[model samples]
Target: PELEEWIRRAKEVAKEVEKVAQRAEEEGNPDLRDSAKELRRAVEEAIEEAKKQGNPELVEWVARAAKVAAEVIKVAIQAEKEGNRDLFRAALELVRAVIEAIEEAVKQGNPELVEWVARAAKVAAEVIKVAIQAEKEGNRDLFRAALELVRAVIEAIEEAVKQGNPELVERVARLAKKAAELIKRAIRAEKEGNRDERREALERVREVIERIEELVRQG
Candidate 1:
């Protein structure tokens, strides 16, 4: 469980550093910004240690942290400079790209990468949860958009597994089969014309997809 522990710790550090960086920017405190930068550097060094020690989990963690931290720094710097809404929006897109990279890393079976992806997935699932709630409230457009995002995530996972390490192919296939079963349940629920049931089924489907996603990440 050392790997798991390392992953958890890495996430904590990354989150803390991000918060500090954001706060520093908001407060207009150069010292706080410096501290945030130092924290980021420390986290990166820890990741390097993981690589040097040949700990797959550590390496994956560091890779993901670096990607995220870079984006955070970029956004922070931009917000400080231009203060333009467009630049801020563009920065968010870059953040999204980092999130996608984390997903890709998981599918590739990079432990460090998977750790980061898992964190991102948690955030994504929350967004999906909100969408599900919106559907219950009869917000058709929001429901559709959320469902599409979930499907897109699933599709991306499938694609990554399919193109992944051959040695991990069998495991990925097994996980994929599980995901397929969940998808089937979602479809069956829909056929019965039961909205509540369908929502529940889709939620279960999401869980299976998450499991497979995790497996892909740790490979």
Candidate 2:
């Protein structure tokens, strides 16, 4: 009976979410599930504010949960930004609660909604794999698809910088730009046959990215 009651609630929630889902669904067709002519594309946007990039409210929330200083929320974001995936993922668990609630509320014996979400995610992985191969051949037409990775990551970093004190902004702007520069340099070198240049530039990006995170943490 509890399960039945929960399912009814999910149906109601799905009814509401459907409006937006329809907008998304229309972007697919035929058997988006079984036969919609095969999904032509799947774009996996990075999880972050577009403007600020890697800045995550979840990272901040997790830090607060761990009793980190609330005033230094930037530090927590930086911790995740600098490579603490666990902290960010842990924070995301809270978001999943709501989505899970909605899914359970809507499920029937078929579990159609859950499968729909899974299919979209599964297709994304395949789409990404294609982009990887495209890069090997220097397929410039896949520019936007491949650039999504860079844009998303950069946005995440900018997000952390934005959350910190305003003074931290200017300090990180240079760091962010330079970080990208060194990385671009490395990529250019890799293809042009300069191992030494590529290696040096590649190493510098991490150091520069870290500098940005450290400055954000100072907030």
Candidate 3:
């Protein structure tokens, strides 16, 4: 059953992120580490939630999304370091798209995604992960692929939001903040790295994600 695959992939993403946490420190950027931790925790929590949800296929979706985003994040961080503007922005957009899809799922009561809420959180780890690619290859194609995924996800959410589905907007406190700003804090987490910047980035990212949830919270 694919429920097992979800568990496996979630574990993979979490494992990949801890390595990211390590490098975020090696590079002297705790912000990436902080976000990396959040992403790990989020993915863990989501996998647990799925175990309770009884949807095998949904797990596969989250798994695929997380795995793909994991690579995208690695590319994103590297892109930022390389000063590849398009890659950086594309990475940021992918995380937002995941949350947006989950939100729309909630609004429509769509089991396809709404059934697994935490799955949406798994992809956010990409910011830190992108900078740590599986290899040292040019990721121009990878970033573009991430962007294509992002655009597709956004279009789906926009449609759902416009329809004004009879559901509360899912107020994702952590996601909103993280979605807007991972680059600013993800420089490198080394001895000379900036914890304050990382902390500020962490707190603020959480703050932005909260605002997104506020709409759903308000509803």
Candidate 4:
């Protein structure tokens, strides 16, 4: 059956990604490696759920996500070799965001949204990297630039919602609100010199923004 076919491919890809991720862990950062591990876990779960329900589409998404995980692991390994910890962490965070996006996609049963959310997450991860650099350098201009990029992304989501149906508009509105609140938490965390808090808050902000992106795309 096609279900078994997809599961077979999914396991194959997961094994390959796991091998690469192990290398990445040995040579790169452990946290980065851990992100891939978590990603693989989520992908495996997704694959199992797909099999249980005989959902070829869900299995297909799991396959694609596993492939992407491999690519992202390569990027982190490259960044590690270059000693670019910020870029390395950004790449890791992308994996985390992808996991979140995929979980959401599964809940909604909308595979295409995972692609859109992952794209948006890539950009948000870059922006968060900038924010980290700005904080490290104490560069207000760079920090403002980071904020502006997030704002731009939010605005784009707003523009899309304007053309959407009422249900989409409502969903987007709630998502946007969550994004804004997360941003506020990020700001507060930064002000308190809590790097961990700031990063986590910003990650949530990015996740919310990605959901908004997916909602808009669906609408």
Candidate 5:
């Protein structure tokens, strides 16, 4: 019964991500389009793993986390489109809900859920990067919100790592360092008014993020 319900919710969340991907495609936003696709894949993979484990608690918790992330991403998409800072902030708050959900899952003492910390962070990162893109459009609020989300995700990842195995530390550190470097380059470019360099840096950051996602999938 729990398995059936999990499958249902999992499909629903996957469908939600599909809708976001479709919207990104229609809107001609390649960044969101690609990241949304990757997010859907990650969510689907997590769902399959949870179902395989056949743990009712993990199933329920995974579904809950994925649902929150999907909801957050949906709202974030709208916020980006309307250039509404309030809506964006609301989305940011929703991300906190997702983080809480993950933390709750971690408290279950399941190593699987700990790995999910990375996956959920990837989802949030996807949405936050969109805000970073919008920042290029002169929206300071969106930029600030992006940075806030980054900080929040880093904090959550740090906490999760402390509670999880030692192996996670290095993987987590690599991602954190790259993310920090991305922000560093962005700031330098902004201070120097080097738009081209900043754009290049953002591209590199996206590539590194995707690579890290692939590594996470493999391990």
Candidate 6:
């Protein structure tokens, strides 16, 4: 069942890749070029076994994959047209499978596997830096997404703390609180039209987010 889910998601990702690939071709845009190729390859490999057996589930998987791919492509195109690098990068990163894979490995307590997965997560965090910065500059949607990620990381750290890492857990919880406070300040600043204050508040928020991200990477 687990393998089946993987195959299903993979097929979905593949279909998204194909759609993006075609859009990239039609619009002559190269930004999503690599993502398209990678998704295609990954999906094909994931479904190789099912393909050999002519599984009926393959069709369902393929259709879902196509729909997802189209959605991603639409986002990519909109981001490109608007010149929103943060949004584009965010969209592309959302489609990446490495983080999920790594999280699963860590849950399994596969030390060696966890090490690599942690590294991938770290890289993904790095990729979000610019987007986080953009959000700090008054992009409400981006900020919300970034805050949600911070909350998720905090929750993960809290879980780890319950499992007996008090020191790290405390540190993570503190950062989470700080991030939440910053989000509150940001909202207030937006309402009051205090651009300068908002920028300063966001800077502090970014620092707290980065600190938590580093802690997770080291953990």
lDDT of 6 by residue, 121-143 (tens): 33334324534554557687546
lDDT of 5 by residue, 99-142 (tens): 44344443443645534553545545554655656565674633
TM-score of each: 0.30, 0.33, 0.48, 0.55, 0.47, 0.46
Best by lDDT: 4
Better of 3 and 5 by TM-score: 3
Q: Where is model 6 more than 4 Å wrong at Cα?
A: 1-6, 48-74, 84-185, 194-204, 216-219
- Compute the lDDT for candidate 5: 0.59
TM-score of 1: 0.30
**lDDT for each residue of candidate 4 in 173-205, tens digit (9 for 90 to 100):** 455445655665776787898888877876776
Evaluation by TM-score, superior candidate among 2 and 5:
5
Model 6: lDDT equals: 0.52
Error of 5 at 62 (Å): 1.8
Predicted structure 3, TM vs. truth: 0.48
Local error of candidate 1 at residue 30 (angstroms):
54
User: Looking at candidate 1, what is the lDDT of residue 34?
Assistant: 64
Tens-place lDDT digits, model 3, residues 116-160: 233333433443243234123343332333333233334333443
lDDT of 5 at 114: 38
lDDT of each model, Cα atoms only? 0.50, 0.33, 0.48, 0.62, 0.59, 0.52
Instruction: Give the C-alpha miss distance for residue 4 in model 4, angstroms.
Output: 2.1
3 or 6, greater by TM-score: 3
Q: Order candidates by lDDT, high to low.
A: 4, 5, 6, 1, 3, 2
**Candidate 6's error at 188, in angstroms?**
4.9
TM-score of 2: 0.33
**Backbone clashes (count) for model 6:** 2
Candidate 2 lDDT over residue span 86-197, tens digit each: 3333223322321331123122212222232222222222333333444455644333332332332233333432342223433444454455455556668767988787
